Amino acid sequence: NIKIMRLVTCEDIIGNISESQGLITIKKAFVIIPLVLCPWQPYTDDKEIVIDDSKVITITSPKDDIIKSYESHTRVLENKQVEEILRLEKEIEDLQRMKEQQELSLTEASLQKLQERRDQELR
Protein backbone atom coordinates (compact mmCIF):
# COMPACT_ATOMS: atom_id res chain seq x y z
CA ASN A 1 0.00 0.00 0.00
CA ILE A 2 2.56 2.56 -1.15
CA LYS A 3 0.99 6.00 -0.74
CA ILE A 4 1.91 9.68 -0.48
CA MET A 5 1.20 11.53 2.77
CA ARG A 6 0.84 15.30 3.18
CA LEU A 7 1.68 16.40 6.72
CA VAL A 8 0.57 19.60 8.42
CA THR A 9 4.17 20.86 8.33
CA CYS A 10 4.12 21.29 4.52
CA GLU A 11 5.81 17.91 4.05
CA ASP A 12 5.31 15.19 1.43
CA ILE A 13 6.38 11.68 2.43
CA ILE A 14 5.90 8.42 0.53
CA GLY A 15 5.69 5.10 2.34
CA ASN A 16 3.80 1.88 2.95
CA ILE A 17 0.83 2.87 5.11
CA SER A 18 -1.74 0.95 7.14
CA GLU A 19 -4.96 2.72 8.11
CA SER A 20 -6.79 2.26 11.42
CA GLN A 21 -9.87 3.97 12.84
CA GLY A 22 -8.00 6.82 14.53
CA LEU A 23 -4.31 6.46 13.73
CA ILE A 24 -2.19 5.24 10.83
CA THR A 25 1.14 3.42 10.67
CA ILE A 26 3.83 4.08 8.07
CA LYS A 27 6.90 2.10 7.01
CA LYS A 28 9.90 3.20 4.93
CA ALA A 29 8.82 6.84 4.86
CA PHE A 30 10.79 9.17 2.59
CA VAL A 31 10.56 12.94 2.25
CA ILE A 32 10.48 14.22 -1.33
CA ILE A 33 12.68 17.20 -2.23
CA PRO A 34 11.89 18.80 -5.65
CA LEU A 35 13.25 14.44 -7.39
CA VAL A 36 15.27 13.52 -4.29
CA LEU A 37 14.26 10.94 -1.67
CA CYS A 38 15.50 11.45 1.88
CA PRO A 39 14.93 9.33 5.01
CA TRP A 40 12.11 10.82 7.05
CA GLN A 41 13.43 9.94 10.53
CA PRO A 42 17.19 9.27 10.36
CA TYR A 43 17.34 9.05 14.16
CA THR A 44 15.33 5.91 15.04
CA ASP A 45 15.67 2.20 14.32
CA ASP A 46 11.93 1.49 14.55
CA LYS A 47 10.44 -0.40 11.62
CA GLU A 48 7.14 1.51 11.65
CA ILE A 49 5.97 4.92 12.86
CA VAL A 50 2.48 5.59 14.22
CA ILE A 51 0.79 8.96 13.68
CA ASP A 52 -2.64 10.38 14.47
CA ASP A 53 -5.00 11.05 11.57
CA SER A 54 -5.76 14.58 12.81
CA LYS A 55 -2.37 15.68 11.42
CA VAL A 56 -3.30 14.45 7.92
CA ILE A 57 -3.84 16.85 5.02
CA THR A 58 -4.08 14.48 2.03
CA ILE A 59 -3.55 10.78 1.39
CA THR A 60 -3.02 9.80 -2.23
CA SER A 61 -1.80 7.06 -4.57
CA PRO A 62 1.46 7.95 -6.36
CA LYS A 63 2.43 7.35 -9.98
CA ASP A 64 4.12 4.21 -11.27
CA ASP A 65 7.46 5.97 -11.84
CA ILE A 66 7.53 7.19 -8.23
CA ILE A 67 6.76 3.68 -6.95
CA LYS A 68 9.53 2.23 -9.12
CA SER A 69 12.03 4.81 -7.86
CA TYR A 70 10.98 4.12 -4.25
CA GLU A 71 11.45 0.37 -4.75
CA SER A 72 14.87 0.88 -6.35
CA HIS A 73 15.96 3.19 -3.53
CA THR A 74 14.90 0.73 -0.83
CA ARG A 75 16.58 -2.19 -2.60
CA VAL A 76 19.83 -0.24 -3.01
CA LEU A 77 19.80 0.75 0.66
CA GLU A 78 19.24 -2.84 1.78
CA ASN A 79 22.03 -4.09 -0.50
CA LYS A 80 24.39 -1.47 0.94
CA GLN A 81 23.44 -2.54 4.47
CA VAL A 82 24.09 -6.23 3.82
CA GLU A 83 27.39 -5.45 2.08
CA GLU A 84 28.49 -3.38 5.09
CA ILE A 85 27.50 -6.23 7.41
CA LEU A 86 29.62 -8.67 5.40
CA ARG A 87 32.57 -6.26 5.40
CA LEU A 88 32.32 -5.90 9.18
CA GLU A 89 32.16 -9.70 9.53
CA LYS A 90 35.41 -10.06 7.60
CA GLU A 91 37.13 -7.22 9.46
CA ILE A 92 36.21 -8.49 12.93
CA GLU A 93 37.26 -12.04 12.03
CA ASP A 94 40.65 -10.84 10.78
CA LEU A 95 41.17 -8.62 13.83
CA GLN A 96 40.25 -11.41 16.26
CA ARG A 97 42.58 -13.89 14.54
CA MET A 98 45.53 -11.48 14.54
CA LYS A 99 44.87 -10.51 18.16
CA GLU A 100 44.84 -14.17 19.19
CA GLN A 101 48.12 -14.70 17.34
CA GLN A 102 49.62 -11.74 19.21
CA GLU A 103 48.34 -13.12 22.52
CA LEU A 104 49.88 -16.53 21.84
CA SER A 105 53.47 -15.23 21.74
CA LEU A 106 53.52 -13.80 25.25
CA THR A 107 55.38 -14.31 28.54
CA GLU A 108 53.79 -15.76 31.67
CA ALA A 109 54.62 -12.72 33.80
CA SER A 110 53.40 -10.45 31.00
CA LEU A 111 50.18 -12.49 30.84
CA GLN A 112 49.63 -12.05 34.58
CA LYS A 113 50.29 -8.32 34.28
CA LEU A 114 47.82 -8.16 31.38
CA GLN A 115 45.18 -9.94 33.46
CA GLU A 116 45.66 -7.56 36.39
CA ARG A 117 45.62 -4.54 34.08
CA ARG A 118 42.38 -5.69 32.43
CA ASP A 119 40.84 -6.23 35.86
CA GLN A 120 41.81 -2.68 36.80
CA GLU A 121 40.36 -1.45 33.49
CA LEU A 122 36.99 -3.06 34.22
CA ARG A 123 37.13 -1.65 37.77
Ligand X SMILES: *C1=CC(=O)N(c2ccc3ccc4cccc5ccc2c3c45)C1=O
Q: Which residues bind ligand X (CB under 6 A)?
A: 9-11, 31, 33-34, 38
Which is nearest to 49 in space by CA: 74, 26, 65, 30?
A: 26
Give the H/E segment covering residue 30.
strand 23-33
23 forms part of the interface with a copy of itself (CB under 8 A): no
**How many whole angstroms separate alpha carbon 65 and alpha carbon 81?**
24
Judge whether 3 and 28 are in contact, CB under 8 Å.
no
Number of residues that bind a copy of itself (CB under 8 A): 54
Q: Residues in the site for a copy of itself, rule: CB under 8 A?
A: 4, 7-10, 12, 32, 41, 43-47, 49-52, 54-58, 60-64, 66, 78, 81-82, 84-86, 88-89, 91-92, 95-96, 99, 101-107, 110, 113-114, 117-118, 121
